[PDB]
Structure formats: C-alpha cells, structure tokens
Amino acid sequence: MPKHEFSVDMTCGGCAEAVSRVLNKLGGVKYDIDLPNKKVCIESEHSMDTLLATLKKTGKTVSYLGLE
Ligand SMILES: [Ag+]
Ligand SMILES: [Ag+]
C-alpha cells in the first residue's frame, strides 16, 4: 500500500491526538506521527489529495513531502 509523507506544523503534544482523530474519521489508514520532525506518514489506498485535504481539517499548514 502507498506510504505518503506530509509536513504538518504540529506545535505541541496535543497534535498527536488531533491528527489521529481526523485520520481515524477518514478511515482506511495506518499512520505514524513524528512530533519532533513535524511529519505524518500515512499508509492508505486514499489519494495524496484526500490525505492532504484531511490533514488540513486540523487547521494546520500541511505540505506533501513524497513517498516513504
Ligand atoms: Ag498541538
Ligand atoms: Ag494540535
């Protein structure tokens, strides 16, 4: 399954739950949240576009980094 990596401007520890919540609501995802590197990696059949839009529902700055 594709593994898409995103920069997410996660500024505090609460952002692990925040990101977990929006991704869980989308569903069909397994992820790893790297708070120190402000990066989220998502294993999914969802498009880069669907994942980008989903992460942006947090209200944060999100950019696509590429594949893991
Ligand atoms: Ag936060
Ligand atoms: Ag947050």
The ligand minimizing its distance to the Cα of 22 is: 2
Please state, in angstroms and as integers, the Cα–Cα distance from residue 38 to each residue in 1, 27, 33, 34, 45, following that order: 23, 22, 8, 6, 23
Rg value, the chain, Cα: 10
36 and 61 Cβ atoms separated by less than 8 Å? no
Domain limits, the chain: 1-68
Resolution (A): 1.8
Q: Which ligand gives the minimal distance to the CA of 60? A: 2
CB-based burial of residue 4 (10 Å sphere; 0-12 exposed, 13-18 middle, 19+ buried)?
buried
Q: 20, 14 in Cβ contact below 8 A?
A: no
The token pair that represents 61 in the structure block: 């700055």
Which residue, among 30, 34, 28, 4, has the nearest Cα to 16 in the 3D structure?
Answer: 34
Q: What experiment produced this structure? A: X-ray
State in Å: Cα 48 to ligand 1 middle. 23
CB atoms within 10 A of CB 9: 12
